Design a protein around this ligand. Structure first.
Ligand SMILES: Cc1ccc(Cl)cc1N1CCN(c2ccc(C(=O)O)cc2NC(=O)c2ccc(Br)cc2)CC1
Ligand SMILES: Nc1nc2c(ncn2[C@@H]2O[C@H](COP(=O)(O)OP(=O)(O)OP(=O)(O)O)[C@@H](O)[C@H]2O)c(=O)[nH]1
Ligand SMILES: [Cl-]
Ligand SMILES: [Cl-]
Ligand SMILES: [Cl-]
Ligand SMILES: [Cl-]
Ligand SMILES: [Cl-]
Ligand SMILES: [Cl-]
Ligand SMILES: [Cl-]
Ligand SMILES: [Cl-]
Ligand SMILES: [Cl-]
Ligand SMILES: [Cl-]
Ligand SMILES: [Cl-]
Ligand SMILES: [Mg+2]
Lengths: 994, 122, 209
């Protein structure tokens, strides 16, 4: 029975609408849902707007009236200009009358704010269509109707706020450039009257709700109005005194004064400087006298979260930071403004202690601006000494772990600046915080961690000699702490913090070999502690120290028999015996960093040989068995050992790159045999068990072997220096091992890592293997395209890797696409356009880039049959495909590269850089230029795609497009203007002359 | 309602329930899986709470008739039918899968689950 | 038990429905099935101040599935605005969702949520996310997939709606579960269902759990 309102052949039962709406908003489960679907169909009915008049008069449910206004909104924004003038004046008068009526009934004004606000926005949508050209008297009439009633005056301030937002704040994407300028200039022309009204209401005062609505509108005005309206009237004084004293007006006034602080102002005028000082003085005086003194515990207040206190304190941080970042130099020169300057900063110190991460970040951005200034600006830091001292404590007590990269970075930079400004103050605070960890008063895991992060963050800031005494003092104190503390949990926490600090002080380690050796040997001891986090931290600290101090491991140090790298490698089985595989790989990676420091070839190769001794021997036995008995590969444990051998090779190759070649050379042939044998077993298992086999531990293990092999080869080739060896030794066996196996596996068994490996091969040596690139295409192109061209979802990794491979082949070995048979070259164009249509930003962007690069590749060929055949066959496919994704609203992230592509395509024809006619014969007078035929094709294409556009709109749009096809920013503007105009009826064709 | 229970075994797990309609596993929770012995009835239940919300994703007796079976895809999971779980209130039947950090953890789980099955026979 | 209307808004594909579903059932939906208009789902948390119920209005982000649009916001007491830290456009659109929301709901607590912080290649950097500051929105990095800060938006809104800054989520009480005997006329029904379930792979066998 609820479905009655959808039956438009009968008149609307208003009371039925009110039940449906009630059921939707106030109902439950199955009943709520049926109402939802019915209301949606009602609202989306293209005639529904005809019923709005009826609903607004005769419904008693304000939810129904709200939905009526939504229906009216769709008409006003989309189809308004189809209506006769008399009908548009009728709707306009109905809406105004309903608003005035609701405002004159105090009861309805108080209780129905939702419906009134919605009415005001509906009115503003009409103003966007009608005003001022077809309504020049709107503003005078609004100003007049304001003196008649407090309620109407307040609501008129809401209409003006919404008008200012729609014209100035949200116009950029919603209107043409021309219509945005028209409405901006229109509001600018009548602002003088509007301001007079707002100032009067603010002077003559009384009604709090009226004052707040007026100030809300002023906040919007401040985004665009000239400074003189603030600085040449009483208004700065009213905002900074009267409106800061009452709490109803205080929040909005503070937001107004923040924006006042951002006005475009003359820089060479003493009166304006004094005015800028005075409003700051007034505002801070009102806060100290009416809200809280400078000493107040804002941490406690914010935590207690009474009323609007949290919001007010956020707004105060935004005001102080914004004003001081622009104006503190005004307060710095003058003895009489010293107290104001330091009080404002003292408020920021108190705000900085609030437990609220996002507010802390806001104050921290200001503190960064200040301490950066004090580091470089002469004769300034002495002003801020007591502020800076307090800030040192605030930053040290709030240091986060370096894992939180942006916040750690911000905090470190502020603490580094503050340490430079007073190293003694920073040192004293850190040592005393450490003393309160040792005496137990401040002891906790969080607190020792925080302090350790802070101590670590300032490494490099002290003189080497001050650093030496400081670091020794901290390591001694942290040792004392560990001994003192009871039970592995506590000892592990402090040992991790010791490892952390030592890791952040390489300069000290590099200068004290005795201590570095001890640290490393202690990390090795810790690689035998199973207590959670200790092995990970010992391994992370080992590689971190190695990254920074690697030279000290590769030389013979005084009083040592050999370079320490030799000592590490000799004991590696014992050192790593208790580590998990990922920890072993870190350790070997770290050893690879050291070995790459050795630039004597013979010695590097020997160290590489010795490091790889255990994995190589495990490899040799597993190959002297794997081959001699192919069954041994089915055993879970053998597969894990093989995968871990390959992973150890990847880790060492990551740190050594080009230096890794002799190791890759040792395993390369047997590694590719293993790849073939493992492939066999995967193929076998999928035959015997089904596609489900690809989910089993055994097949995942085998596939892991294949993926780590492909990862090892891509790692080496991506860093290789000798490309002749890559081409002559590596590529041919690689392609023989991987390409046919990829092609001849079922989709669910194909490793996307193959595409990734081939992308690196084409990248690095594509120019040297023209026949190899052809073979890569023949093997992967059609079978990968068939996996990914049924939908946008299946095989997401293959999808991404596929368009990366085509991108690089198109960049490096375009001749591989010339070799394709005509039908295969057609699939390539289909594949590029398919990429355009994706929502996945990885695919879409490569798709558009391939399209650009291909046009560029075709252009390069000059006037020859392939380039002329390409244009005849594909130019209009590329133009129309690019227009489709530009205009369909489902591909907005692609806008910039879509516009670039369309600009290139249009410019080819505009510059007469296409040699043949683009039209097939007897389709247009045979003399006709490609420029006239392109104009015709696009006019026709846009007319069928957007039939509600006029011929005038399309012709004006295309005239603008073709004129602007050498100016990307302006061309993009014309495109965005067209995207606005296709969403409505009756768009002005003169907009394209902007 | 856990203050009258001894904690026999604690392990981190992810729990799945089988939707027969969709023919796919759907995750039900991640967090601490606990074996709890009621000190009045000496009855051992599985009680599993989600990370951060601590909402109950499993609450049922380790019935003697239940059998832990391998999943084709995992060497660190068990599947088993449950006839009466009250995580979401009213007792319902589920096909559950529970997955652990390691094969070791899953094997230990099964050891402990048999230990609790015997304790439940008394 | 008190109940509050929560409206969830943001661009299509940002993770609104995925986030709510995980809160309702514990499940992680990998597929993108666009919401049509709105889905309404009751969501209950147990607090040290008793249970709190959110009536969650999970709205459509795609223009073409928008339905009643701002019509969904009427008498909302709180809101989440969602974007995707892997998609810049979704953050560029946050001011538009906030605009439409506060025009209808003038004085409600709102959390801004940057979803999908589990994805390595992050596009909307911490440095860039400042919109919440002048608008007095709470902000959280979240992941519906890793459950990073998963409970934070609701805990913050609960603290604001109840007016207790020390409100905590607590372990929901755990009743003794019933004992049963297997019904012998479904013995043959169970071996089947259990056979299908053993031979259907568990998702994401490469995760920590
Ligand atoms: C115990 C510990 C755990 C982890 C790590 Cl990474 C290192 C250690 N050290 C081992 C023994 N060390 C000493 C043991 C004894 C003595 C000594 O006074 O003779 C000195 C030192 N070392 C230092 O003073 C020191 C080392 C590195 C850095 Br950066 C800064 C300071 C100190 C703690
Ligand atoms: N990696 C990752 N993916 C996520 C996360 N949250 C959601 N997704 C995925 O992203 C998509 C989001 O889908 P939905 O939750 O339906 O998106 P929505 O915001 O509800 O979209 P509309 O209903 O159209 O407004 C799905 O494929 C989810 O699996 C997250 O935290 N991480
Ligand atoms: Cl202007
Ligand atoms: Cl300045
Ligand atoms: Cl050095
Ligand atoms: Cl190994
Ligand atoms: Cl081909
Ligand atoms: Cl296709
Ligand atoms: Cl089109
Ligand atoms: Cl239209
Ligand atoms: Cl629920
Ligand atoms: Cl942030
Ligand atoms: Cl904030
Ligand atoms: Mg959704």
């Amino acid at each position: 029975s609820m479905e009655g309102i959808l039956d438009f052949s009968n008149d609307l039962d208003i009371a039925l609408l009110d039940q449906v709406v009630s059921t939707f908003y106030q109902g439950e489960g199955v009943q709520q849902k049926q109402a939802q679907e019915i209301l949606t169909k009602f609202q989306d009915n293209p005639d529904a707007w005809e019923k709005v008049d009826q609903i607004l008069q005769f419904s008693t449910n304000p939810q129904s009236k709200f939905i009526a206004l939504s229906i009216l909104d769709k008409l006003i924004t989309r189809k308004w200009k189809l209506l006769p003038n008399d009908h548009r004046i009728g709707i306009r008068n109905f809406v105004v009358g309903m608003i005035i009526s609701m405002c004159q009934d105090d009861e309805v004004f108080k209780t129905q704010k939702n419906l009134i606000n919605k009415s005001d926005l509906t009115l503003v949508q009409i103003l966007k269509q009608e005003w001022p050209q077809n309504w020049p008297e709107f503003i005078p009439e609004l100003i007049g109707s304001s003196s008649s009633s407090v309620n109407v005056c307040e609501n008129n301030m809401i209409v003006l706020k919404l008008l200012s937002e729609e014209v100035f704040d949200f116009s950029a994407e919603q209107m043409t450039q021309a219509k945005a300028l028209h409405l901006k200039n229109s509001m600018s022309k009548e602002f003088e009257q509007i301001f007079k009204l707002c100032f009067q209401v603010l002077e003559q005062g009384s009604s709090s709700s009226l004052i707040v609505a007026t100030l809300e509108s002023l906040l919007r005005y401040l985004h665009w109005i000239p400074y003189r309206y603030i600085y040449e009237t009483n208004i700065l004084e009213l905002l900074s005194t009267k409106f800061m004293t009452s709490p109803d007006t205080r929040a909005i006034t503070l937001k107004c004064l923040t924006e006042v602080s951002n006005l475009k102002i003359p820089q060479d005028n003493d009166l304006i400087k004094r005015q800028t000082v005075l409003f700051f003085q007034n505002t801070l005086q009102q806060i100290a006298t009416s809200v809280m003194p400078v000493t107040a515990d804002l941490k406690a207040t914010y935590a207690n979260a009474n009323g609007n206190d949290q919001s007010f304190l956020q707004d105060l941080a935004m005001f102080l930071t914004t004003y001081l970042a622009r104006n503190r130099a005004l307060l710095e020169s003058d003895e009489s403004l010293r107290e104001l300057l330091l009080n404002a900063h003292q408020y920021l110190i108190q705000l900085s202690k609030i437990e609220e991460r996002e507010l802390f970040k806001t104050t921290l951005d200001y503190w960064h601006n200040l301490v950066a200034d004090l580091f470089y600006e002469p004769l300034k830091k002495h002003i801020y000494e007591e502020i800076c001292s307090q800030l040192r404590l605030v930053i040290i007590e709030n240091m986060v772990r370096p894992e939180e990269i942006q916040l750690y970075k911000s905090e470190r930079e502020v603490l580094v600046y503050l340490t430079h400004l007073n190293v003694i103050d920073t040192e004293e605070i850190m040592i005393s915080k450490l003393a309160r960890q040792i005496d137990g008063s401040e002891w906790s895991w969080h607190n020792i961690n925080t302090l350790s992060w802070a101590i670590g963050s300032i490494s490099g800031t002290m003189s080497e000699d001050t650093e030496k005494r400081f670091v020794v003092t901290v390591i001694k104190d942290l040792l004392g702490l560990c001994e003192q503390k009871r039970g592995k949990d506590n000892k592990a926490v402090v040992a991790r913090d010791i490892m952390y600090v030592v890791g952040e002080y390489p300069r000290f380690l590099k200068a004290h070999w005795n201590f570095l050796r001890t640290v490393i040997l202690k990390l090795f001891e810790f690689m035998h502690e199973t207590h959670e986090g200790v092995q990970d931290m010992a391994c992370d600290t080992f590689i971190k120290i190695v990254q920074k101090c690697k030279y000290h491991f590769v030389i013979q140090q005084p009083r040592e028999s050999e370079p320490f790298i030799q000592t590490i490698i000799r004991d590696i089985q014992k050192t790593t015996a208790d580590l998990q595989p990922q920890q072993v790989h870190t350790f070997y990676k770290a050893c690879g960093i050291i070995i790459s420091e050795e630039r004597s070839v013979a010695e590097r190769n020997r160290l590489l040989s010795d490091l790889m001794q255990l994995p190589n021997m495990a490899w040799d036995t597993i190959v002297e068995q794997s081959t001699a008995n192919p069954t041994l590969l089915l055993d879970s444990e053998t597969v894990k050992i093989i995968a871990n051998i390959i992973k150890t090779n990847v880790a060492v190759c990551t740190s050594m790159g080009a230096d890794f070649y002799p190791q890759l050379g040792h395993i390369y042939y047997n590694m590719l045999q293993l790849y073939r044998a493992v492939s066999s077993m995967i193929s076998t298992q999928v035959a015997a068990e089904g596609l489900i086999a690809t989910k089993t531990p055994k097949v995942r293990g085998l596939r892991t072997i294949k993926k780590e092999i492909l990862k090892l080869v891509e790692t080496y080739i991506s860093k290789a220096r000798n490309l002749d060896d890559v081409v002559k030794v590596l590529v041919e066996p690689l392609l023989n091992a991987v390409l046919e196996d990829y092609m001849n596996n079922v989709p669910d068994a194909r490793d996307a890592e193959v595409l990734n490996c081939m992308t690196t091969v084409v990248e690095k040596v594509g120019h040297m293997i023209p026949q190899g690139v052809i073979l890569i295409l023949q093997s992967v192109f059609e079978c990968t395209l068939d996996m990914i061209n049924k939908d946008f979802t299946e095989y997401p990794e293959h999808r991404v890797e596929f368009y990366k491979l085509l991108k690089v082949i198109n960049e490096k070995s375009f001749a591989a696409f010339l070799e394709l048979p005509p039908a295969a070259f057609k699939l390539f164009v289909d594949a590029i356009c398919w990429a355009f249509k994706h929502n996945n930003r990885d695919v879409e962007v490569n798709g558009l880039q391939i399209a650009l690069d291909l046009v560029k590749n075709i252009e390069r060929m000059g006037n020859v049959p392939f380039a002329n055949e390409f244009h005849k066959n594909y130019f209009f496919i590329f133009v129309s495909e690019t227009f489709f994704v530009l205009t369909d609203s489902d591909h907005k992230s692609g806008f910039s590269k879509q516009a670039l592509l369309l600009m290139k395509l249009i410019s080819l024809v505009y510059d007469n850089k296409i040699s043949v006619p683009l039209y097939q014969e007897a389709e247009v007078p045979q003399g006709t230029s490609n420029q006239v035929y392109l104009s015709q094709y696009l006019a026709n294409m846009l007319s069928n795609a957007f039939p509600h556009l006029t011929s005038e709109q399309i012709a004006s749009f295309l005239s603008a497009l073709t004129k602007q096809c050498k100016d990307l920013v302006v061309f993009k503007g014309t495109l965005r203007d067209f995207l606005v105009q296709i969403k409505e009826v009756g768009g002005d064709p003169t907009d394209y002359l902007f | 309602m856990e203050e009258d229970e001894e904690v026999l075994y604690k392990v981190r797990a992810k729990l799945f329930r089988f939707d027969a309609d969709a023919k796919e596993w759907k995750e039900r929770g991640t967090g601490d899986c606990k074996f709890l012995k009621n000190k009045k009835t000496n009855k051992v239940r599985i009680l599993m709470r989600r990370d951060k919300t601590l909402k109950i994703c499993a609450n049922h007796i380790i019935a003697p008739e239940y059998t832990l079976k391998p999943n084709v895809g995992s060497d660190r999971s068990w599947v088993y039918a449950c006839t009466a779980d009250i995580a979401e209130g009213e007792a319902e039947a589920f096909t559950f899968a529970i997955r652990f950090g390691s094969k070791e953890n899953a094997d230990k789980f099964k050891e402990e689950f048999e230990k609790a099955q015997e304790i439940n026979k008394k | 038990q008190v109940q509050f209307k929560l409206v969830l808004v943001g661009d299509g594909g940002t993770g609104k429905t995925t986030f709510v579903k995980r809160h309702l059932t514990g499940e992680f939906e990998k597929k993108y099935v666009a919401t049509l208009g709105v889905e309404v789902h009751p969501l209950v948390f147990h607090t040290n101040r008793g249970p709190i119920k959110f009536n969650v209005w999970d709205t459509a982000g795609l223009e073409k599935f928008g339905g009643l649009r701002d019509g969904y916001y009427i008498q909302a007491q709180c809101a989440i605005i969602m974007f995707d830290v892997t998609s810049r456009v979704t953050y560029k659109n946050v001011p538009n969702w906030h605009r439409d929301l506060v025009r209808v709901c003038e004085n409600i607590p709102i959390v801004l949520c940057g979803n999908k912080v589990d994805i390595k290649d992050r596009k909307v950097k911490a440095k860039s996310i400042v919109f919440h500051r002048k608008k007095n929105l709470q902000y959280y990095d979240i992941s519906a997939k890793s459950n990073y800060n998963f409970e934070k938006p609701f805990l913050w809104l609960a603290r604001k709606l109840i007016g207790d800054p020390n409100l905590e989520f607590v372990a929901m009480p755990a009743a003794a579960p019933p004992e049963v005997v297997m019904d012998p006329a479904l013995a043959a029904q169970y071996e089947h269902d259990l056979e299908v379930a053993q031979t259907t792979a568990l998702p994401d066998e490469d995760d920590d759990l």
